[PDB]
Amino acid sequence: VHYWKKVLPLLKIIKKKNSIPEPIDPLFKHFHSVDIQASEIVEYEEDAHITFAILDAVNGNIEDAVTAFESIKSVVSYWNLALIFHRKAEDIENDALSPEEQEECKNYLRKTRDYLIKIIDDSDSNLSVVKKLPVPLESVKEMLNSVMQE
Amino acid sequence: IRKWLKQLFHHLPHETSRLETNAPESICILDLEVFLLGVVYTSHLQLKEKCNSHQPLCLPLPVCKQLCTERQKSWWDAVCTLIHRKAVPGNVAKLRLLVQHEINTLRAQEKHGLQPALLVHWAECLQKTGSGLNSFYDQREYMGRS
Amino acid sequence: SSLDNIEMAYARQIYIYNEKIVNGHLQPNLVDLCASVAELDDKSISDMWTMVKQMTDVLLTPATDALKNRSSVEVRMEFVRQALAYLEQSYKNYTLVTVFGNLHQAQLGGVPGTYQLVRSFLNIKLPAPLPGLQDGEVEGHPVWALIYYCMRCGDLLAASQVVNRAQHQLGEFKTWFQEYMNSKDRRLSPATENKLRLHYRRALRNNTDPYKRAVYCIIGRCDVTDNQSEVADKTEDYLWLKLNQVCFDPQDRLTLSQFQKQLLEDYGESHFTVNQQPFLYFQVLFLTAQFEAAVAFLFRMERLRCHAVHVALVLFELKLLLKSSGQSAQLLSHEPGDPPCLRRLNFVRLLMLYTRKFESTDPREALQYFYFLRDEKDSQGENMFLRCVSELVIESREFDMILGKLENDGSRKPGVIDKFTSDTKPIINKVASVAENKGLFEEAAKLYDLAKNADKVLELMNKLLSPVVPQISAPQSNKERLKNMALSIAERYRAQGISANKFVDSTFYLLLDLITFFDEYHSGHIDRAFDIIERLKLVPLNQESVEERVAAFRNFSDEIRHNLSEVLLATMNILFTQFKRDRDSQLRSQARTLITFAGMIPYRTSGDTNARLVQMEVLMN
């Protein structure tokens, strides 16, 4: 997130096709071979917004993390959405507690199952998506087996 | 007690997200749990004072008279009728306000009619109530209020 | 004072509302506290607050999020009813002033029944009979005119009475209307609603009686595109005509979201402000639940800033205003992860603008408005109210008034901020911190001393004293004005047993002794001044003490080592004078001691000083 927060100001200037202030004796040689282009800007802004959401989730701002994750239909956002929906279910799933709450708890586990299935459905169909998986495919399937046996 | 209230007001959240206001749509099982504690802590002391002027445990339920103040009873009857959806469209606004009046006390807000001993009793009674819970959600809530 | 008559009166009302919350009292009705001033102005403003109260007087869910209340179909439905009840009553007052010249005039004779009023209203607005009316008359007026203006005034009963005296003429309309009056939410049953709509659409789509057309699709909520411009010629008549046509869950149907968006998107301010009448547009936005739009809009009229800020506060103290999370956004915006039909108000900026106007010479009133920001923070974590008080003190430089003046006797008369929070230690350091960063040490000391932060008070007091240690203390000089404050800080720090770490503290009382050493030296009290320097054990006078005194100089504050040059010379010049007045051996021995000390000490102007010291010792012999 830190490095992202430092780039986005640059990307915005690059987004309007302006010039970046070149460095003074840089430590890591600059190259125009990999200079960022407008074609890729919106992607980074998106990929960054994921990284923001992930940290928000890890810190506790689940409401804002989910709100962000759901906004973009990405394979990685599924694994995050699924991973955090599963945790809200598992903890509340077996202790004595309000029955109405228990139904809401199960409902989250139902969402987990769905998102993992969307991952595998889109994964098996296309190879490019297999490479975007934030974790290995077999790991995603591993959770699903346990998710449904729950 | 927390299990009693779950048996009465089903799917009433333990703690309401919108704790900022005292509107009685934000009533929570904690508020009720905090309420009954005072009702009993208050009732016990009142009866203790009575017999001192004149066993209190020994009275059976029908024989004994009202053990709570009509104020407290009015509140419970109101929030009950409201939650269970057996209020009256006309009286909705009145019932709603009757509940609202006491919320600020159950949450120790502006001008709470709370003796320090009753607050402490609420605090520890919730800590130990929460410290024995298994889940984190419930632990956090009860510890927070405490 | 930068506050106009109206703005000032509002400030006082907001002080009350703050005094109540600052003393824990009952949360009074803010909307009522604002309408209290409105009556002091023209009715253009009073009728606004009347709308504000009635549009906000909806049963809410206390302690619930703002966005949730405003998204719930439950609340969105009651808004439409509260507005319709305002448009109906508002029109009813128009009908009174139309018949009687003054509201007072109508009241003395007695407000007549809505039926007889409407009848006495038709007499004027249609003196001659229109040839296109239908279904005859009733007691001298067309039956459909009476029904419409009765429904427009909001008295369905008065309208139903009209129907009862024309049962034969109106046909099946009786059983339909009697159902509309019974069913809540001004809606009929789908079956009966279908029966009348198809009948109207069948052969009455274009009838020569406009009042008949209006009533039918007000009862059936049909022909939403036809604005019935024959009868609804005013703007309020349009709003009321449509809010009686909105629906809730595909053809010939309009919903509040479509209507509210359709109005301002297609027909923006431009359409509703061509007559240079601002409230007309405000009423359009406010009576459609678009409170943020109406607030920002009305906040731009430089003559109505006061009113738009407060109608924002009311919506804010009622958990109805939709605040903008980010403080970097514009005044009005739609969050990216929200539906497009709702808008958000950058409430923080809103108050920040209003305040800058009268924050310069009216601080007290500014704080009252800054308090509403107590519940918000910024990206850096500071409490918005606390930060606003820091910025307001840095700019206004009103320390005694806002922070409480700490007199030189040990008292702390509380300031205006003391009312709002009892933890005033951070901001006093914040304000003291910047003034310290701006080389305003004499102030930063007074401020740090106000918060009883002796670590910083004595630190700064060390810097202000060292330059002035050897100087001549003369009336009104910078020495007197600093020495006298340092002593007023020495007493109050001893009587109250306060002290910083020994490094800062030792140096502070050491300088005070030296300042006394030169004040006695410059006065010619040689004997008295010699005694002081001897106590301090700073300069050796017997050869045995040279080793230890030399080691001590290494770890003494540089604010002391700086003035070592002047101390040695004064002490020497002291012995020097006493010599010209056994004792001779004793002075001679001490003279030597000072030299060897100075010889082993590397210090300021050691060149000129070490030379002069040696010369003065030679003249002694």
CSV table of N, CA, C and O in Angstrom, one decimal, chain A residues 47-139:
chain,number,residue,atom,x,y,z
A,47,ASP,N,-5.8,-2.5,-9.6
A,47,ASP,CA,-5.0,-3.4,-8.9
A,47,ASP,C,-4.6,-2.8,-7.5
A,47,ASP,O,-4.4,-3.5,-6.5
A,48,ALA,N,-4.3,-1.5,-7.5
A,48,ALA,CA,-4.0,-0.8,-6.3
A,48,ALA,C,-5.1,-0.8,-5.3
A,48,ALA,O,-5.0,-1.1,-4.1
A,49,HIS,N,-6.3,-0.4,-5.8
A,49,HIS,CA,-7.5,-0.4,-5.0
A,49,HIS,C,-7.8,-1.7,-4.3
A,49,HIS,O,-8.3,-1.8,-3.2
A,50,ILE,N,-7.4,-2.8,-5.0
A,50,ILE,CA,-7.5,-4.2,-4.3
A,50,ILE,C,-6.5,-4.2,-3.1
A,50,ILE,O,-6.9,-4.6,-2.0
A,51,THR,N,-5.3,-3.8,-3.4
A,51,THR,CA,-4.3,-3.8,-2.3
A,51,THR,C,-4.7,-2.9,-1.1
A,51,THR,O,-4.5,-3.3,0.0
A,52,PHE,N,-5.3,-1.8,-1.4
A,52,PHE,CA,-5.9,-1.0,-0.3
A,52,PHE,C,-7.0,-1.8,0.4
A,52,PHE,O,-6.9,-2.0,1.7
A,53,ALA,N,-7.9,-2.4,-0.3
A,53,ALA,CA,-9.0,-3.2,0.4
A,53,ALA,C,-8.4,-4.3,1.2
A,53,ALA,O,-8.8,-4.5,2.3
A,54,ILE,N,-7.4,-5.0,0.7
A,54,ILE,CA,-6.9,-6.1,1.4
A,54,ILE,C,-6.3,-5.7,2.8
A,54,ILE,O,-6.6,-6.3,3.8
A,55,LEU,N,-5.6,-4.5,2.8
A,55,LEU,CA,-5.1,-4.0,4.0
A,55,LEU,C,-6.2,-3.6,4.9
A,55,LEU,O,-6.2,-3.8,6.1
A,56,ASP,N,-7.3,-2.9,4.4
A,56,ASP,CA,-8.4,-2.5,5.1
A,56,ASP,C,-9.0,-3.8,5.8
A,56,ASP,O,-9.4,-3.7,7.0
A,57,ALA,N,-9.1,-4.9,5.1
A,57,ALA,CA,-9.7,-6.1,5.7
A,57,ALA,C,-8.8,-6.6,6.8
A,57,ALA,O,-9.3,-7.0,7.9
A,58,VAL,N,-7.5,-6.6,6.6
A,58,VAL,CA,-6.6,-7.1,7.6
A,58,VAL,C,-6.6,-6.2,8.9
A,58,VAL,O,-6.4,-6.7,10.0
A,59,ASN,N,-6.9,-4.9,8.7
A,59,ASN,CA,-6.9,-4.0,9.8
A,59,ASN,C,-8.2,-4.1,10.6
A,59,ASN,O,-8.3,-3.9,11.8
A,60,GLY,N,-9.3,-4.4,9.9
A,60,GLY,CA,-10.6,-4.5,10.5
A,60,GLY,C,-11.7,-3.7,9.9
A,60,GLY,O,-12.9,-3.9,10.2
A,61,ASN,N,-11.4,-2.9,8.9
A,61,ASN,CA,-12.4,-2.2,8.1
A,61,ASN,C,-13.0,-3.1,7.1
A,61,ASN,O,-12.9,-2.9,5.8
A,62,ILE,N,-13.8,-4.1,7.6
A,62,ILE,CA,-14.4,-5.1,6.7
A,62,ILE,C,-15.4,-4.4,5.8
A,62,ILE,O,-15.5,-4.7,4.6
A,63,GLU,N,-16.2,-3.6,6.4
A,63,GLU,CA,-17.3,-2.9,5.6
A,63,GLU,C,-16.8,-2.2,4.4
A,63,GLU,O,-17.3,-2.4,3.3
A,64,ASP,N,-15.7,-1.4,4.5
A,64,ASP,CA,-15.1,-0.8,3.4
A,64,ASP,C,-14.4,-1.7,2.5
A,64,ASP,O,-14.4,-1.5,1.2
A,65,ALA,N,-13.8,-2.8,3.0
A,65,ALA,CA,-13.1,-3.7,2.2
A,65,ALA,C,-14.0,-4.5,1.3
A,65,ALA,O,-13.8,-4.6,0.1
A,66,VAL,N,-15.1,-5.0,1.8
A,66,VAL,CA,-16.1,-5.7,1.0
A,66,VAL,C,-16.7,-4.8,0.0
A,66,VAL,O,-16.8,-5.1,-1.2
A,67,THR,N,-17.1,-3.6,0.4
A,67,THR,CA,-17.7,-2.6,-0.5
A,67,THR,C,-16.7,-2.4,-1.7
A,67,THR,O,-17.2,-2.2,-2.8
A,68,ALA,N,-15.4,-2.3,-1.4
A,68,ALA,CA,-14.5,-2.2,-2.5
A,68,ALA,C,-14.3,-3.4,-3.3
A,68,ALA,O,-14.4,-3.4,-4.6
A,69,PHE,N,-14.0,-4.6,-2.7
A,69,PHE,CA,-13.9,-5.8,-3.3
A,69,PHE,C,-15.0,-6.1,-4.3
A,69,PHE,O,-14.8,-6.5,-5.5
A,70,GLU,N,-16.2,-6.0,-3.8
A,70,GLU,CA,-17.4,-6.3,-4.6
A,70,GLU,C,-17.5,-5.3,-5.8
A,70,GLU,O,-18.1,-5.7,-6.9
A,71,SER,N,-16.9,-4.1,-5.8
A,71,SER,CA,-17.1,-3.2,-6.9
A,71,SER,C,-16.4,-3.7,-8.1
A,71,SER,O,-16.8,-3.4,-9.2
A,72,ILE,N,-15.3,-4.5,-8.0
A,72,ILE,CA,-14.6,-5.0,-9.1
A,72,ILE,C,-14.7,-6.5,-9.2
A,72,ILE,O,-14.4,-7.1,-8.2
A,73,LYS,N,-15.1,-7.0,-10.3
A,73,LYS,CA,-15.4,-8.4,-10.5
A,73,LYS,C,-14.0,-9.1,-10.9
A,73,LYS,O,-13.8,-9.4,-12.1
A,74,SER,N,-13.1,-9.3,-10.0
A,74,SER,CA,-11.8,-9.9,-10.2
A,74,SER,C,-11.7,-11.2,-9.5
A,74,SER,O,-12.3,-11.4,-8.5
A,75,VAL,N,-10.9,-12.1,-10.1
A,75,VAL,CA,-10.7,-13.4,-9.5
A,75,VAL,C,-10.1,-13.2,-8.1
A,75,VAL,O,-10.5,-13.9,-7.1
A,76,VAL,N,-9.2,-12.3,-7.9
A,76,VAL,CA,-8.5,-12.1,-6.6
A,76,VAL,C,-9.5,-11.6,-5.6
A,76,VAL,O,-9.5,-12.0,-4.4
A,77,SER,N,-10.4,-10.7,-6.0
A,77,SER,CA,-11.4,-10.2,-5.1
A,77,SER,C,-12.3,-11.3,-4.6
A,77,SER,O,-12.8,-11.2,-3.4
A,78,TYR,N,-12.5,-12.4,-5.4
A,78,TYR,CA,-13.3,-13.5,-4.9
A,78,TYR,C,-12.6,-14.2,-3.7
A,78,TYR,O,-13.2,-14.4,-2.7
A,79,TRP,N,-11.3,-14.6,-3.9
A,79,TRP,CA,-10.6,-15.2,-2.9
A,79,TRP,C,-10.5,-14.4,-1.6
A,79,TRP,O,-10.6,-15.0,-0.5
A,80,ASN,N,-10.5,-13.1,-1.7
A,80,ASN,CA,-10.6,-12.2,-0.5
A,80,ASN,C,-12.0,-12.2,0.0
A,80,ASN,O,-12.2,-12.5,1.2
A,81,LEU,N,-13.0,-11.9,-0.8
A,81,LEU,CA,-14.3,-11.9,-0.4
A,81,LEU,C,-14.7,-13.3,0.3
A,81,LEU,O,-15.2,-13.3,1.4
A,82,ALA,N,-14.3,-14.4,-0.4
A,82,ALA,CA,-14.5,-15.7,0.2
A,82,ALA,C,-13.8,-15.9,1.5
A,82,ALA,O,-14.4,-16.3,2.5
A,83,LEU,N,-12.5,-15.5,1.6
A,83,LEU,CA,-11.8,-15.8,2.8
A,83,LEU,C,-12.3,-15.1,4.0
A,83,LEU,O,-12.2,-15.6,5.1
A,84,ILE,N,-12.8,-13.9,3.8
A,84,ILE,CA,-13.4,-13.1,4.9
A,84,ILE,C,-14.8,-13.4,5.2
A,84,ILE,O,-15.2,-13.3,6.4
A,85,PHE,N,-15.6,-13.9,4.2
A,85,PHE,CA,-16.9,-14.4,4.5
A,85,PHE,C,-16.9,-15.7,5.3
A,85,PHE,O,-17.7,-15.9,6.2
A,86,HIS,N,-15.9,-16.5,5.0
A,86,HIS,CA,-15.7,-17.8,5.7
A,86,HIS,C,-15.4,-17.6,7.2
A,86,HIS,O,-15.9,-18.3,8.0
A,87,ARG,N,-14.6,-16.6,7.5
A,87,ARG,CA,-14.2,-16.3,8.8
A,87,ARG,C,-15.4,-15.8,9.7
A,87,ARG,O,-15.6,-16.3,10.8
A,88,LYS,N,-16.2,-15.0,9.1
A,88,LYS,CA,-17.4,-14.5,9.8
A,88,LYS,C,-18.4,-15.6,10.1
A,88,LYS,O,-19.1,-15.6,11.1
A,89,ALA,N,-18.4,-16.7,9.3
A,89,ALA,CA,-19.2,-17.8,9.5
A,89,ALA,C,-18.6,-18.8,10.5
A,89,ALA,O,-19.3,-19.2,11.5
A,90,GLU,N,-17.4,-19.2,10.3
A,90,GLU,CA,-16.8,-20.3,11.1
A,90,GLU,C,-16.8,-20.0,12.6
A,90,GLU,O,-17.2,-20.9,13.4
A,91,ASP,N,-16.5,-18.8,13.0
A,91,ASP,CA,-16.4,-18.4,14.4
A,91,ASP,C,-17.8,-18.6,15.1
A,91,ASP,O,-18.0,-19.1,16.2
A,92,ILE,N,-18.9,-18.0,14.4
A,92,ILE,CA,-20.2,-18.0,14.9
A,92,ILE,C,-21.0,-19.3,14.7
A,92,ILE,O,-22.1,-19.4,15.1
A,93,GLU,N,-20.4,-20.3,14.0
A,93,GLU,CA,-21.2,-21.4,13.4
A,93,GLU,C,-21.7,-22.4,14.5
A,93,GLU,O,-22.7,-23.0,14.2
A,94,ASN,N,-21.0,-22.6,15.6
A,94,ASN,CA,-21.4,-23.7,16.5
A,94,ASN,C,-21.7,-23.3,17.9
A,94,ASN,O,-22.2,-24.2,18.6
A,95,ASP,N,-21.4,-22.1,18.4
A,95,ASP,CA,-21.7,-21.8,19.8
A,95,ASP,C,-23.2,-21.5,20.0
A,95,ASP,O,-23.9,-21.1,19.0
A,96,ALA,N,-23.7,-21.8,21.2
A,96,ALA,CA,-25.0,-21.4,21.5
A,96,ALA,C,-25.3,-19.9,21.4
A,96,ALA,O,-24.6,-19.1,22.0
A,97,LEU,N,-26.2,-19.5,20.5
A,97,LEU,CA,-26.5,-18.1,20.2
A,97,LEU,C,-27.8,-18.0,19.5
A,97,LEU,O,-28.5,-19.0,19.2
A,98,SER,N,-28.3,-16.8,19.4
A,98,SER,CA,-29.6,-16.5,18.9
A,98,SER,C,-29.8,-17.3,17.6
A,98,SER,O,-29.0,-17.2,16.7
A,99,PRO,N,-31.0,-18.0,17.4
A,99,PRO,CA,-31.2,-18.8,16.2
A,99,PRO,C,-31.2,-18.0,15.0
A,99,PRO,O,-30.7,-18.3,13.9
A,100,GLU,N,-31.9,-16.8,15.1
A,100,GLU,CA,-31.9,-15.9,13.9
A,100,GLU,C,-30.5,-15.5,13.5
A,100,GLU,O,-30.2,-15.5,12.3
A,101,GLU,N,-29.6,-15.2,14.4
A,101,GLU,CA,-28.2,-15.0,14.1
A,101,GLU,C,-27.5,-16.2,13.4
A,101,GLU,O,-26.8,-16.0,12.5
A,102,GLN,N,-27.8,-17.4,13.9
A,102,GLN,CA,-27.3,-18.6,13.3
A,102,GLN,C,-27.6,-18.7,11.9
A,102,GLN,O,-26.8,-19.0,11.0
A,103,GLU,N,-28.8,-18.3,11.5
A,103,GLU,CA,-29.2,-18.4,10.1
A,103,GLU,C,-28.4,-17.4,9.3
A,103,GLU,O,-28.0,-17.7,8.2
A,104,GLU,N,-28.2,-16.2,9.8
A,104,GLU,CA,-27.4,-15.2,9.2
A,104,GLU,C,-25.9,-15.7,9.1
A,104,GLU,O,-25.2,-15.4,8.1
A,105,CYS,N,-25.5,-16.4,10.1
A,105,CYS,CA,-24.1,-17.0,10.0
A,105,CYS,C,-24.0,-18.0,8.9
A,105,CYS,O,-23.0,-17.9,8.1
A,106,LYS,N,-24.9,-18.9,8.8
A,106,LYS,CA,-24.9,-19.9,7.8
A,106,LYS,C,-24.9,-19.2,6.4
A,106,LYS,O,-24.2,-19.6,5.5
A,107,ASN,N,-25.7,-18.1,6.3
A,107,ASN,CA,-25.8,-17.4,5.0
A,107,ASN,C,-24.4,-17.0,4.5
A,107,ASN,O,-24.2,-17.0,3.3
A,108,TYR,N,-23.5,-16.6,5.4
A,108,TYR,CA,-22.2,-16.2,4.9
A,108,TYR,C,-21.4,-17.4,4.4
A,108,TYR,O,-20.8,-17.3,3.3
A,109,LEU,N,-21.5,-18.5,5.1
A,109,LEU,CA,-20.9,-19.7,4.6
A,109,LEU,C,-21.4,-20.1,3.2
A,109,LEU,O,-20.7,-20.7,2.4
A,110,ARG,N,-22.7,-19.8,2.9
A,110,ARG,CA,-23.2,-20.0,1.6
A,110,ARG,C,-22.6,-19.1,0.6
A,110,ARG,O,-22.3,-19.6,-0.6
A,111,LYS,N,-22.3,-17.9,0.9
A,111,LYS,CA,-21.6,-17.0,0.0
A,111,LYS,C,-20.1,-17.4,-0.3
A,111,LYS,O,-19.7,-17.4,-1.4
A,112,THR,N,-19.4,-17.9,0.8
A,112,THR,CA,-18.1,-18.5,0.6
A,112,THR,C,-18.1,-19.5,-0.5
A,112,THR,O,-17.3,-19.5,-1.4
A,113,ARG,N,-19.0,-20.5,-0.3
A,113,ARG,CA,-19.1,-21.6,-1.3
A,113,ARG,C,-19.3,-21.1,-2.7
A,113,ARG,O,-18.6,-21.5,-3.6
A,114,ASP,N,-20.1,-20.1,-2.9
A,114,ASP,CA,-20.4,-19.5,-4.2
A,114,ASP,C,-19.2,-18.9,-4.8
A,114,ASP,O,-18.9,-19.1,-6.0
A,115,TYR,N,-18.5,-18.1,-4.0
A,115,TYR,CA,-17.3,-17.4,-4.6
A,115,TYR,C,-16.2,-18.3,-4.9
A,115,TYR,O,-15.5,-18.2,-6.0
A,116,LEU,N,-15.9,-19.4,-4.1
A,116,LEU,CA,-14.9,-20.4,-4.5
A,116,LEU,C,-15.3,-21.1,-5.7
A,116,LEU,O,-14.5,-21.4,-6.6
A,117,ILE,N,-16.6,-21.3,-5.9
A,117,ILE,CA,-17.1,-22.0,-7.2
A,117,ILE,C,-16.9,-21.1,-8.4
A,117,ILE,O,-16.4,-21.6,-9.4
A,118,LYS,N,-17.2,-19.8,-8.2
A,118,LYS,CA,-16.9,-18.9,-9.3
A,118,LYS,C,-15.4,-18.9,-9.7
A,118,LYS,O,-15.1,-18.7,-10.9
A,119,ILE,N,-14.5,-19.0,-8.7
A,119,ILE,CA,-13.1,-19.1,-9.0
A,119,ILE,C,-12.8,-20.3,-9.8
A,119,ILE,O,-12.1,-20.1,-10.9
A,120,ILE,N,-13.3,-21.4,-9.4
A,120,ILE,CA,-12.9,-22.7,-10.2
A,120,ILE,C,-13.6,-22.7,-11.5
A,120,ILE,O,-13.0,-23.1,-12.5
A,121,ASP,N,-14.8,-22.2,-11.6
A,121,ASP,CA,-15.5,-22.1,-12.9
A,121,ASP,C,-14.7,-21.3,-13.9
A,121,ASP,O,-14.4,-21.7,-15.0
A,122,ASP,N,-14.4,-20.0,-13.5
A,122,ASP,CA,-13.6,-19.2,-14.4
A,122,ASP,C,-12.2,-19.7,-14.5
A,122,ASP,O,-11.6,-19.4,-15.6
A,123,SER,N,-11.7,-20.4,-13.5
A,123,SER,CA,-10.3,-20.8,-13.6
A,123,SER,C,-10.1,-21.9,-14.7
A,123,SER,O,-9.3,-21.8,-15.6
A,124,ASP,N,-11.0,-23.0,-14.6
A,124,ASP,CA,-10.8,-24.1,-15.5
A,124,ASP,C,-11.1,-23.6,-17.0
A,124,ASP,O,-10.5,-24.2,-17.9
A,125,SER,N,-11.8,-22.6,-17.2
A,125,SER,CA,-12.2,-22.2,-18.5
A,125,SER,C,-11.0,-21.5,-19.2
A,125,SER,O,-10.8,-21.7,-20.4
A,126,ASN,N,-10.3,-20.6,-18.5
A,126,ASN,CA,-9.3,-19.8,-19.1
A,126,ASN,C,-8.0,-19.9,-18.3
A,126,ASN,O,-8.0,-20.0,-17.1
A,127,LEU,N,-6.8,-19.9,-19.1
A,127,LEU,CA,-5.5,-20.1,-18.4
A,127,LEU,C,-5.1,-18.7,-17.8
A,127,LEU,O,-4.4,-18.7,-16.8
A,128,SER,N,-5.3,-17.6,-18.5
A,128,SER,CA,-4.9,-16.3,-18.0
A,128,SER,C,-5.4,-16.1,-16.6
A,128,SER,O,-4.7,-15.5,-15.7
A,129,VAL,N,-6.6,-16.5,-16.3
A,129,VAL,CA,-7.2,-16.4,-14.9
A,129,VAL,C,-6.4,-17.3,-13.9
A,129,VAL,O,-6.3,-16.9,-12.8
A,130,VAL,N,-6.0,-18.5,-14.4
A,130,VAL,CA,-5.2,-19.4,-13.5
A,130,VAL,C,-4.0,-18.7,-12.9
A,130,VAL,O,-3.6,-18.9,-11.8
A,131,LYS,N,-3.4,-17.8,-13.7
A,131,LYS,CA,-2.2,-17.1,-13.3
A,131,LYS,C,-2.5,-16.0,-12.4
A,131,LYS,O,-1.6,-15.5,-11.6
A,132,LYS,N,-3.7,-15.4,-12.4
A,132,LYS,CA,-4.1,-14.3,-11.6
A,132,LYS,C,-4.5,-14.8,-10.2
A,132,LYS,O,-4.6,-13.9,-9.3
A,133,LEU,N,-4.7,-16.1,-10.0
A,133,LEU,CA,-5.1,-16.6,-8.7
A,133,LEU,C,-4.1,-16.1,-7.6
A,133,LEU,O,-2.9,-16.3,-7.8
A,134,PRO,N,-4.6,-15.5,-6.5
A,134,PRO,CA,-3.6,-15.1,-5.5
A,134,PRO,C,-3.0,-16.2,-4.7
A,134,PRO,O,-2.0,-16.0,-4.1
A,135,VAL,N,-3.6,-17.4,-4.8
A,135,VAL,CA,-3.1,-18.6,-4.2
A,135,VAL,C,-3.2,-19.7,-5.2
A,135,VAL,O,-3.8,-19.5,-6.3
A,136,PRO,N,-2.6,-20.9,-5.0
A,136,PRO,CA,-2.7,-22.0,-6.0
A,136,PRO,C,-4.1,-22.5,-6.2
A,136,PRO,O,-4.9,-22.4,-5.3
A,137,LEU,N,-4.4,-23.0,-7.4
A,137,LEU,CA,-5.7,-23.5,-7.7
A,137,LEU,C,-6.1,-24.6,-6.7
A,137,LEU,O,-7.2,-24.7,-6.2
A,138,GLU,N,-5.1,-25.6,-6.5
A,138,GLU,CA,-5.4,-26.7,-5.6
A,138,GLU,C,-5.7,-26.2,-4.2
A,138,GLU,O,-6.4,-26.9,-3.5
A,139,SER,N,-5.1,-25.1,-3.8
A,139,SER,CA,-5.4,-24.5,-2.5
A,139,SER,C,-6.8,-24.0,-2.4
A,139,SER,O,-7.5,-24.2,-1.4
